[PDB]
């Protein structure tokens, strides 16, 4: 999981 | 997974760089949770007080809905258990407060 | 500080264990922020759309206030800069959404 | 900061 981001709905994602 | 991805990283834990729950038309209560295996050990969860929203007369209006605003937050889970210096990153879905929304109702 | 407190801990980064912004009487917009020195690198900030709250007619009622619901969240800051495996724990105050509150107004 | 906690207002504190 090199890139961890929040989406606009408050959930985290591995990008 | 990617073998170049670090399975362990170092983290320095030294961080350096009125209330709405009652006054809201979608008021909420707060529930405490404590887990010594988690860092932070204490988190709070908002629970909407009512199904509807409070109107100008102080009564519940059921034509509107109180809903919780949620987000995922990061915490550290001790791994192995009780470890003072070894953790796994963890995500938790927390309710931060409530808002008042127009319901989904079809005029069929 | 306490000399027994670990200044560095290990963290395994492998995590394993409709929308209200528009429908709310205190609606909000979302602003994106990206910083590659932060993990998570992308966070979003809610900004309340209006000073007042939306009434049954779809108009802004200025006798009520839209206010942001905020919380501090944990993130990791790369330290030294650009480090792939060394961080400092950091806290950020984020606005998650908005709620509608009765204003503080004195009948003097 | 042996004990990190949220208060009921969403702020973190060292206890």
Author numbering:
A (entry chain C), D (entry chain C): 1 to 15
B (entry chain A), C (entry chain A): 14 to 30, 41 to 131
What does the report in the manuscript say about this coordinate set?
Binding of IL-17A to a heteromeric receptor complex stimulates various signal transduction pathways such as NF-κb and AP-1. IL-17A protein is characterized by two pairs of β-strands that are stabilized by two disulfide bonds.
In particular, the structure of IL-17A in complex with peptide 18–902 is crystallized in space group P21212 with two “half-molecules” in the asymmetric unit. In both copies, the internal IL-17A loop (Arg31-Ser40), which has been observed to be ordered in the complex with receptor, is disordered in the peptide complex. The bound peptide forms a β-hairpin structure in the complex, which is covalently linked at the ends by the disulfide bond between Cys1 and Cys14 and held together by antiparallel β-sheet hydrogen bonds between Val3, Glu5, Asp7 and Arg15, His13, Ala11, respectively. Comparison of our structure to the published structure of the IL-17A/IL-17RA complex reveals that the IL-17A pocket occupied by the 18–902 overlaps with the β-hairpin (between strands C-C’) of the receptor while interacting with the cytokine. Trp in particular is able to form the hydrogen bond observed in the crystal structure to the sidechain of Asp15 of the cytokine, which may explain the higher affinity of peptides 18–902, 18–964, 18–972, and 18–967. Peptide 18–902 disrupts Region II of the interface but does not perturb the structure of the cytokine.
